[PDB]
Amino acid sequence: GPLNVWVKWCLIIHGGYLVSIPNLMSTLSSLHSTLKRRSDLLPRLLALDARLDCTINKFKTLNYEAGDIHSSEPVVEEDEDDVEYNEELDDAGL
Amino acid sequence: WHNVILSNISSNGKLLAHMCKDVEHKSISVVSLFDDSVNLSFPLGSILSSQTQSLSYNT
Amino acid sequence: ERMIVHRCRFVDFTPATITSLAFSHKSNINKLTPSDLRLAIGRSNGNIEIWNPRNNWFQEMVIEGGKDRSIEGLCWSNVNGESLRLFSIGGSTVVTEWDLATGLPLRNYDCNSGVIWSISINDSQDKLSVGCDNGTVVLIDISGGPGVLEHDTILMRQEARVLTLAWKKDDFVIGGCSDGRIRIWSAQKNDENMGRLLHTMKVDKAKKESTLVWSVIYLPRTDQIASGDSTGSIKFWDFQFATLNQSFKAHDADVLCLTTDTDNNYVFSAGVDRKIFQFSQNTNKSQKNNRWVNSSNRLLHGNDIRAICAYQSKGADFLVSGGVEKTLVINSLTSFSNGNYRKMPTVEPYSKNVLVNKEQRLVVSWSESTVKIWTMGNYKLVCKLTLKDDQNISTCSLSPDGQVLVVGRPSTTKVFHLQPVGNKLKVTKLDNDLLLRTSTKLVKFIDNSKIVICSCEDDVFIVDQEVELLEVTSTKSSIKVPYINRINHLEVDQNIAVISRGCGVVDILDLKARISKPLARLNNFITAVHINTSRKSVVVITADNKIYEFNMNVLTQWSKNNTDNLPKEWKTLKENCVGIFSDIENSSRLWFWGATWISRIDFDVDFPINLTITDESNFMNDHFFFTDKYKPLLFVDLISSNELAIIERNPQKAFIQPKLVF
Amino acid sequence: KQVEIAERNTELWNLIALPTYTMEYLDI
Amino acid sequence: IKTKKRKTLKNLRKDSVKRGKFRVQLLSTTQDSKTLPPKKESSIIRSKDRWLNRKALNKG
Amino acid sequence: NILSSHLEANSTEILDDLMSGSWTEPEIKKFILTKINTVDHLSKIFLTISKSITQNPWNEENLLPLWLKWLLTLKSGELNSIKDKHTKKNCKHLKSALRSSEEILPVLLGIQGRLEMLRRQAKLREDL
Amino acid sequence: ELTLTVLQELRKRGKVRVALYGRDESTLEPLLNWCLKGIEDVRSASIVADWVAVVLELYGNTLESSPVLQELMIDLKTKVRHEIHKSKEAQRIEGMLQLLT
RNA sequence: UGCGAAAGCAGUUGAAGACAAGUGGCUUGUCGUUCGUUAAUGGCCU
């Protein structure tokens, strides 16, 4: 991310020296290999983000069909005052 | 043996078993060949389990 | 309207794990199945069900135990000519013998040494071994009569706890212990070496943990001891010379229980790795060489197998097995690997734990020592009663109008006034010491105030007083199985009741004159009884899955053609109909249900024509609608003229035996 | 807009339970 | 009342209090001793089920 | 509104190209999803949009490709099971019409790099 | 490289699906939480691509139920968005020095 | 299956007979049968 800003400016400014050099690829092989291995897999993560984004907005729109329902759905309870009226030994007591 | 599917002979060569295909299904018969010591036969549905008849053909 | 159906899954009534199976009679292949054969199932919450394997395993009685009670072993005893006797150990220092009539302990014999780990019964059944935690084996003299138990002899002690027992004959007693060893004591009275341990054998220990010998049986056709231990290995030991013949490395974890057939051609074995292994010696070469082979292996259970037993007669040859998953499994003995099997439902509610009342749309349900009440609306839990002055619960009923609940166990009963205070209830005890002293099985509410009470000692009171009740002829099966002449059912509405005892006797009773007018008229155990006010009828259904109806003041013509025009669903039914009621909108249609289906028969129509106890053995003597899409079923009822209440069940670590991956 | 059309087309190329209480009905 | 309800429940339920050098035990009732078998020893029941759920057999 | 007019027209019997035109008229994303969520069956919308995107795999309108990608997101449990006799060669020729863009995304990104280099050195050498 | 080689051995050898069958929310979160880190590298991202593709192929309903791996899928989406911007701009640098031959 | 480049481009999927199950036929499904078409909880050694 940050360093290829440097490499695009080196090509733009020194566009004459390294077009007059006789073996461009042989002299900066490591750049060619790095960019080839970075951009070679671009169809693969194209297919990955297509398949990923499809399921992502699929559940997003299915859950946005009912996104307001889970805001007040939880009406759960606990051992309420029926437990106090339940404790028959504590009903003989108090 | 008028229809044979599969066959094998014992290590000493003293008897041999084989299959028949004689009707609902196949059959299995063993026979001693160098003597009439034993020769038996039975349908192999009595070999096979009761689970295998409701399962795939590999069973 | 059409039928609107409340498919409720609120009640989480869950049974407990089967820990002990036993058969009442021993095997005797070449004679008929006796009419007195009962299977006994001790669970782990402390209740003992007693099932009869006639016509697909109905459940006759249930003997419940209370809070913090369990049951680990149980053994039958039937000296020929005397009543059945049922002893059981819990996790305690006593043996508990139960009388089968009341469903109570009639004896708590404290064994005089330590906490009992196992129990076994002598061959000829006059003595009882209890193997205890402090290494003792205690003999209890049983033959004094039913109820009276004497101490006999503490056998020669040892260090480690004896976890399983068996007898050779009247002579020797074999015991597997928790130090990986198998001792052999002599219980032969009037010998010089009586009580001292004759032999000790040691199984192949586990490398990285202690070894426990969990199951030991004697095999009388040969002269061996079979033994399963906690490595999974199963060993066969020659009794004389006290030494191993052959060891199999069968299971992957412990072997909790193993059993054999009559002639000892097979040994079945099972444990925590949840497979049942079968070891066979049926070949003539196997019998003349004394060589068991590891014949087969089946995976049928879900979590464990903690109990296994076998029965084998002329019209019955099945091994029965149960474990941590709460269901029972029946397989065939001589056709184990080949034949079929039946996994029973986890509950078949012959005794219900749920009932509804149509007013307030409410339903009560009681598990062990607590009741709970909720209303329909959704649904809302309005009240509950976790009465802990109680220890054990049993049957319960609500007043019509929903005013007073009455809970009742075989020791006492208690009545609670209820007042709906809105989104809650207020519940208050109302004192009555007659109720507080009486034993109750069934309470069924003649009026809003009057109830009828069936006592565990065969008394029929009417409170808020005494129904004359005639006596029954005591035959051999009634003296053998001592609860056959006990009132199972009573159903009542509007001053007319009917009771039912399992000999095939169903007797009406007018609540005014309190006279019987008997209509016994039956052949076997009666599954359910419901009274039709239309037609003036009683409706009995027996264990053979036949519906009879009779009139009151013998069977009607509708019964006379219905019984043999009965549908194919009823003719191939496997689970007995435990509940009948009548429809609410029509007073003449009736709506009934078993544990895996719901049916409804029509009062006038008739339709046109064109692994059990199956022998010639007797019983205990000597528009039509059918659905099953609510099959894990617990209770159904009605509320009003269009809706239905279908309350069912819904679901633990287990030994992973993985399915093949692809 | 050509790389946008090409990205979307390539996406097309590589693109090629029980509750606790119900209420239902059955036959009368 | 929320932090001592089990305290007052157990202190009213339990018996056999101390009196100086002595200890005044209640005797139980024939009611419970003849309606039920005694409770399991939780030590040995925990030993048996803890053995059958030991870590060496990988349950799941 | 106009989405309901397009819904009624495409649901009655006919006017499928005009129906996709009326869908392209208002053309909301939320209503675009709603028109897929409402209908219970299609009259081979996949077939007509298959032939439209086959005849124009390079159109500047995003309407029919947006409709196809939301149809494939929300209803592809049923497009693989509605029909498999003409639909098989339909998806075949659609897949072969669309694979060429996957073939030529690298050269377009290369030319984008070319042109950014040229325009940035031309902005650079701007004669003081 | 050890996580990568056991992923590649399960990919070549048998079945990604066999290795992923009995899972649920709590037992997939290690895989996806590593796939966040592995999607950045060149050497892992093909394997990360097909493993994420298979797990969303056969766990599309757990996507609906559990919200606490929805957010993991969203974070994975922004990761593949950053990586696809990187793999596009690398092709642009590749063209812009292909111009200088 | 054919031509191909690793992309893709054209073609599909019949008949007879026997047997099994279900309700002599009728339906469905198989085949250690023929003709034609380019076409079973069961996992790896010391």
Side-chain angles (χ1 to χ4, degrees), chain A residues 1-62 66-67 74 92-93, chain B, chain C residues 1-610 623-662, chain D, chain E, chain F residues 9 21 26 35-128, chain G:
Chain A
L3 291 188
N4 79 324
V5 192
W6 289 79
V7 82
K8 55 187 46 187
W9 276 123
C10 291
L11 297 155
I12 281 172
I13 292 181
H14 303 109
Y17 199 97
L18 61 99
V19 74
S20 44
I21 203 64
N23 42 3
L24 181 67
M25 39 87 78
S26 188
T27 39
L28 51 97
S29 68
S30 74
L31 191 84
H32 283 97
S33 63
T34 312
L35 298 169
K36 176 69 64 186
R37 75 195 264 273
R38 277 298 328 189
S39 71
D40 222 349
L41 72 157
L42 167 69
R44 178 64 67 252
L45 70 155
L46 278 166
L48 178 59
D49 78 279
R51 265 169 181 82
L52 177 57
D53 167 70
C54 163
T55 74
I56 281 175
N57 50 47
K58 188 167 176 301
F59 74 76
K60 184 160 295 306
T61 63
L62 176 137
Chain B
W1 306 280
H2 270 288
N3 266 329
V4 286
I5 280 179
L6 199 64
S7 161
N8 203 334
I9 302 106
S10 88
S11 85
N12 41 2
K14 285 299 173 298
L15 61 154
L16 69 97
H18 54 280
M19 294 182 62
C20 306
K21 195 182 159 56
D22 170 41
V23 295
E24 69 271 355
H25 293 144
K26 305 157 279 292
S27 182
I28 282 182
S29 39
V30 197
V31 53
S32 177
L33 71 159
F34 282 98
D35 194 292
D36 199 351
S37 298
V38 62
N39 46 359
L40 48 87
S41 176
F42 41 84
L44 86 166
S46 62
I47 283 188
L48 282 145
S49 318
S50 79
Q51 295 93 26
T52 44
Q53 71 206 337
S54 64
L55 259 55
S56 315
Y57 189 44
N58 289 325
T59 47
Chain C
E1 301 273 61
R2 67 179 176 266
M3 210 75 207
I4 169 172
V5 171
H6 275 169
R7 187 174 144 90
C8 303
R9 291 184 219 83
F10 315 128
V11 181
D12 275 350
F13 158 71
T14 45
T17 82
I18 297 172
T19 66
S20 280
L21 302 179
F23 270 113
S24 80
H25 286 226
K26 59 170 60 68
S27 275
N28 212 329
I29 179 66
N30 68 322
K31 284 173 54 189
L32 276 196
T33 317
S35 316
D36 305 329
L37 178 72
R38 303 298 187 272
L39 164 68
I41 309 184
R43 299 294 229 267
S44 84
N45 71 276
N47 42 3
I48 312 172
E49 291 95 325
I50 293 171
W51 295 64
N52 197 336
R54 298 260 151 84
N55 43 69
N56 312 283
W57 267 269
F58 53 95
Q59 170 186 351
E60 300 188 340
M61 81 167 307
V62 56
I63 318 182
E64 193 188 312
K67 166 183 181 181
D68 203 76
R69 263 77 166 175
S70 159
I71 164 170
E72 269 72 22
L74 63 98
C75 49
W76 287 100
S77 175
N78 41 3
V79 178
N80 185 48
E82 293 85 349
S83 280
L84 259 53
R85 230 188 315 176
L86 182 88
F87 320 93
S88 87
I89 69 172
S92 187
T93 46
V94 315
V95 197
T96 295
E97 181 196 318
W98 314 79
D99 55 339
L100 286 309
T102 76
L104 291 152
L106 91 161
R107 193 61 209 274
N108 293 5
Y109 192 78
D110 191 281
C111 163
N112 298 108
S113 91
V115 192
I116 314 292
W117 270 93
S118 63
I119 183 163
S120 191
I121 175 70
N122 185 15
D123 172 75
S124 61
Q125 302 181 357
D126 51 328
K127 271 158 188 62
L128 202 73
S129 316
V130 285
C132 322
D133 185 271
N134 58 316
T136 43
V137 189
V138 188
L139 297 183
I140 294 180
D141 190 11
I142 288 306
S143 88
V148 44
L149 317 181
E150 301 301 86
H151 175 94
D152 187 27
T153 283
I154 285 185
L155 264 43
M156 162 177 282
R157 289 186 166 79
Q158 71 177 18
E159 285 274 76
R161 38 192 192 189
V162 38
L163 308 189
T164 178
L165 286 154
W167 285 71
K168 161 156 173 167
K169 269 181 299 165
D170 272 296
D171 305 315
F172 291 100
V173 44
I174 313 164
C177 318
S178 76
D179 66 280
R181 278 178 199 84
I182 304 170
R183 269 82 165 191
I184 291 172
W185 291 270
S186 93
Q188 39 195 358
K189 199 199 165 301
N190 56 62
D191 205 309
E192 69 163 72
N193 43 16
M194 155 67 191
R196 62 187 283 107
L197 74 93
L198 262 70
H199 291 108
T200 316
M201 299 157 289
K202 179 157 162 271
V203 311
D204 286 355
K205 301 191 95 68
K207 184 53 162 152
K208 269 181 298 298
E209 63 189 355
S210 88
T211 169
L212 324 173
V213 169
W214 278 114
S215 197
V216 160
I217 61 177
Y218 180 71
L219 306 180
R221 194 257 314 170
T222 176
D223 204 12
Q224 296 163 357
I225 313 159
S227 91
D229 57 271
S230 69
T231 54
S233 73
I234 292 163
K235 292 145 170 311
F236 297 91
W237 317 76
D238 199 13
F239 191 91
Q240 69 152 353
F241 309 129
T243 178
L244 184 140
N245 293 351
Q246 53 190 351
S247 173
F248 298 91
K249 190 175 288 208
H251 297 70
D252 283 28
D254 318 351
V255 187
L256 296 180
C257 52
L258 48 88
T259 189
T260 179
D261 65 321
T262 322
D263 271 330
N264 303 285
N265 297 334
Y266 307 96
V267 164
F268 299 90
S269 76
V272 52
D273 78 312
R274 89 200 214 199
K275 282 194 283 184
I276 298 187
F277 276 73
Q278 164 201 49
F279 293 82
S280 89
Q281 211 191 60
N282 44 27
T283 297
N284 201 294
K285 207 189 72 170
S286 294
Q287 287 196 4
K288 80 153 170 287
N289 290 165
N290 207 328
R291 300 305 279 179
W292 305 87
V293 307
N294 183 11
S295 170
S296 294
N297 179 20
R298 286 192 99 166
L299 181 57
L300 301 171
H301 285 255
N303 204 295
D304 272 10
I305 295 101
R306 298 214 173 189
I308 198 170
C309 71
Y311 190 64
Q312 197 178 6
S313 275
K314 195 164 266 287
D317 56 349
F318 34 76
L319 74 151
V320 192
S321 39
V324 158
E325 81 160 5
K326 283 83 179 179
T327 80
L328 196 79
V329 163
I330 291 98
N331 282 80
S332 199
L333 263 191
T334 178
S335 161
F336 173 70
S337 45
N338 210 308
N340 301 275
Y341 77 107
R342 183 181 156 201
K343 179 168 294 182
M344 304 284 293
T346 167
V347 280
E348 294 198 20
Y350 286 74
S351 182
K352 281 86 185 172
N353 271 13
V354 174
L355 77 153
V356 319
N357 259 7
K358 326 190 188 74
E359 56 267 355
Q360 302 102 41
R361 286 163 56 169
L362 86 172
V363 46
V364 299
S365 69
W366 58 102
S367 277
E368 183 74 76
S369 169
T370 171
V371 316
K372 285 177 173 179
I373 315 101
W374 38 88
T375 46
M376 320 315 283
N378 212 49
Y379 74 109
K380 181 59 194 58
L381 198 149
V382 300
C383 172
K384 82 171 172 169
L385 283 180
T386 78
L387 67 159
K388 67 99 176 172
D389 44 357
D390 204 12
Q391 296 196 258
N392 44 359
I393 209 78
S394 172
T395 78
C396 189
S397 52
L398 196 46
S399 72
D401 87 328
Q403 201 60 48
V404 289
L405 191 81
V406 53
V407 309
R409 71 204 39 81
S411 47
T412 186
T413 181
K414 267 179 171 305
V415 188
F416 316 98
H417 181 109
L418 305 148
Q419 213 274 349
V421 303
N423 52 0
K424 185 59 74 178
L425 262 72
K426 169 63 61 189
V427 47
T428 166
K429 283 85 191 162
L430 65 155
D431 303 65
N432 197 288
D433 204 75
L434 176 60
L435 281 304
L436 211 58
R437 286 182 326 267
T438 38
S439 91
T440 69
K441 291 220 287 187
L442 304 105
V443 285
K444 284 301 273 287
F445 264 107
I446 320 287
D447 273 12
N448 191 72
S449 172
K450 321 194 64 59
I451 70 171
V452 55
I453 292 154
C454 192
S455 191
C456 317
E457 50 276 0
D458 256 358
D459 314 327
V460 278
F461 305 130
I462 304 96
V463 313
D464 212 357
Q465 190 72 20
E466 163 68 31
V467 156
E468 305 279 53
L469 204 40
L470 78 162
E471 292 87 5
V472 282
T473 301
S474 314
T475 179
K476 40 189 156 304
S477 311
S478 59
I479 200 64
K480 199 56 161 291
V481 194
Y483 59 89
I484 293 297
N485 303 150
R486 298 281 147 153
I487 306 299
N488 308 329
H489 303 89
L490 56 85
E491 192 43 76
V492 69
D493 44 13
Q494 299 302 98
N495 318 293
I496 173 68
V498 54
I499 65 187
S500 175
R501 39 181 95 193
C503 38
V505 162
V506 44
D507 272 25
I508 207 177
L509 68 91
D510 179 34
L511 274 303
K512 303 287 103 176
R514 305 197 290 258
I515 310 298
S516 83
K517 182 72 82 173
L519 58 158
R521 324 310 157 215
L522 271 178
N523 200 23
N524 45 2
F525 183 81
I526 304 151
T527 318
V529 177
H530 177 78
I531 40 181
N532 216 7
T533 58
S534 309
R535 283 160 172 80
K536 312 297 188 178
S537 194
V538 286
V539 179
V540 311
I541 45 169
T542 185
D544 198 12
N545 283 146
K546 295 185 164 308
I547 318 182
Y548 297 146
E549 89 166 2
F550 321 110
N551 311 278
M552 324 180 302
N553 189 39
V554 196
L555 54 88
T556 77
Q557 69 281 69
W558 177 47
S559 275
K560 210 195 306 175
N561 44 36
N562 209 344
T563 304
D564 296 322
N565 272 10
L566 199 64
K568 65 175 200 324
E569 285 85 354
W570 283 74
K571 282 168 177 293
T572 63
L573 193 63
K574 283 296 183 172
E575 281 85 356
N576 284 348
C577 174
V578 297
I580 316 181
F581 41 87
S582 198
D583 200 359
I584 169 159
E585 63 93 34
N586 178 35
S587 164
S588 194
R589 259 193 322 273
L590 64 159
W591 192 281
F592 31 65
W593 59 281
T596 173
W597 50 270
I598 287 149
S599 164
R600 182 253 301 272
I601 202 55
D602 214 338
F603 49 88
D604 66 323
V605 313
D606 288 305
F607 271 19
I609 303 105
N610 205 17
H623 198 272
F624 158 69
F625 167 66
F626 196 94
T627 197
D628 43 43
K629 61 187 288 185
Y630 322 105
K631 66 105 171 182
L633 185 55
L634 207 150
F635 183 81
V636 312
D637 209 290
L638 285 156
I639 300 106
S640 85
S641 315
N642 45 351
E643 79 264 46
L644 205 56
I646 319 289
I647 170 67
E648 321 162 6
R649 275 180 86 261
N650 52 326
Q652 173 51 264
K653 286 159 151 302
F655 193 80
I656 37 176
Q657 289 185 355
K659 190 70 179 181
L660 212 54
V661 296
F662 32 64
Chain D
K1 67 181 179 290
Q2 287 301 112
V3 306
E4 292 294 327
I5 309 179
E7 185 178 2
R8 72 100 190 274
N9 291 346
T10 51
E11 185 183 6
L12 266 301
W13 154 227
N14 297 115
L15 183 56
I16 300 300
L18 209 58
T20 185
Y21 162 72
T22 66
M23 207 162 47
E24 67 269 60
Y25 311 91
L26 53 86
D27 42 349
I28 307 104
Chain E
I1 203 64
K2 180 171 161 170
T3 70
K4 66 102 175 177
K5 46 214 191 183
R6 69 189 62 82
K7 164 160 79 171
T8 195
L9 171 62
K10 191 205 59 74
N11 289 34
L12 271 296
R13 167 187 53 237
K14 85 151 162 55
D15 68 270
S16 178
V17 305
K18 194 151 56 180
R19 280 289 193 274
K21 216 181 59 185
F22 312 97
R23 176 157 304 270
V24 199
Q25 186 88 241
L26 260 304
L27 48 86
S28 277
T29 81
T30 52
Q31 204 268 352
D32 53 63
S33 278
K34 278 77 170 153
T35 185
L36 276 178
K39 315 183 164 195
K40 51 180 187 190
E41 193 65 43
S42 294
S43 316
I44 76 149
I45 311 302
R46 194 198 156 260
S47 164
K48 185 173 191 308
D49 69 3
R50 164 187 172 82
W51 177 254
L52 292 169
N53 314 132
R54 64 202 190 262
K55 197 202 171 300
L57 36 86
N58 306 120
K59 300 299 217 48
Chain F
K35 277 139 92 186
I36 314 293
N37 291 339
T38 44
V39 297
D40 76 282
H41 205 263
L42 51 89
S43 42
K44 290 302 173 282
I45 312 182
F46 200 94
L47 164 73
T48 174
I49 295 196
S50 175
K51 281 194 301 311
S52 74
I53 302 300
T54 310
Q55 82 182 359
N56 205 325
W58 286 108
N59 215 338
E60 327 292 333
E61 50 92 26
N62 44 4
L63 271 306
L64 298 187
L66 187 59
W67 200 266
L68 185 51
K69 76 180 275 279
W70 278 109
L71 191 78
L72 267 172
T73 292
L74 302 156
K75 281 294 168 182
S76 192
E78 301 89 15
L79 317 171
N80 51 0
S81 61
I82 39 181
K83 170 62 156 31
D84 284 311
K85 297 303 151 297
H86 272 55
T87 310
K88 293 255 198 171
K89 71 196 58 56
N90 274 311
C91 311
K92 170 170 291 180
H93 60 52
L94 201 58
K95 72 85 189 173
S96 49
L98 288 182
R99 53 169 286 282
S100 311
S101 64
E102 188 266 329
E103 300 286 295
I104 67 150
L105 192 50
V107 283
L108 268 68
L109 285 164
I111 300 158
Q112 180 156 333
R114 264 67 162 257
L115 291 166
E116 195 68 21
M117 185 183 196
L118 292 172
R119 72 161 281 261
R120 260 200 305 172
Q121 78 174 64
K123 192 253 175 178
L124 183 144
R125 188 65 256 177
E126 44 86 27
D127 303 317
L128 55 83
Chain G
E1 60 266 68
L2 291 193
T3 46
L4 182 69
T5 190
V6 55
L7 282 187
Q8 288 202 327
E9 278 286 340
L10 289 176
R11 170 181 167 276
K12 146 192 74 183
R13 175 166 314 263
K15 208 188 209 212
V16 187
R17 325 199 180 273
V18 159
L20 287 172
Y21 268 156
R23 309 302 176 92
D24 43 357
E25 192 270 320
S26 86
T27 70
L28 278 180
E29 193 265 319
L31 183 133
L32 281 306
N33 219 27
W34 185 86
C35 278
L36 298 196
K37 278 86 189 172
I39 204 53
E40 300 154 343
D41 199 285
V42 174
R43 312 165 266 219
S44 46
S46 176
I47 312 297
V48 176
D50 69 81
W51 273 82
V52 174
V54 166
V55 66
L56 57 88
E57 180 208 318
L58 90 164
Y59 287 97
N61 219 56
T62 310
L63 289 186
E64 173 273 349
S65 71
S66 157
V68 304
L69 51 83
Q70 298 184 151
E71 56 90 19
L72 206 46
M73 295 305 243
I74 295 166
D75 215 346
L76 194 37
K77 173 65 183 174
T78 73
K79 285 293 186 190
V80 190
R81 195 48 78 197
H82 293 346
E83 296 293 286
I84 203 174
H85 159 60
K86 291 218 287 193
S87 202
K88 275 190 297 196
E89 73 166 355
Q91 185 61 73
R92 308 212 206 102
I93 310 291
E94 205 270 348
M96 91 192 274
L97 97 168
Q98 186 76 20
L99 163 67
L100 260 50
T101 293

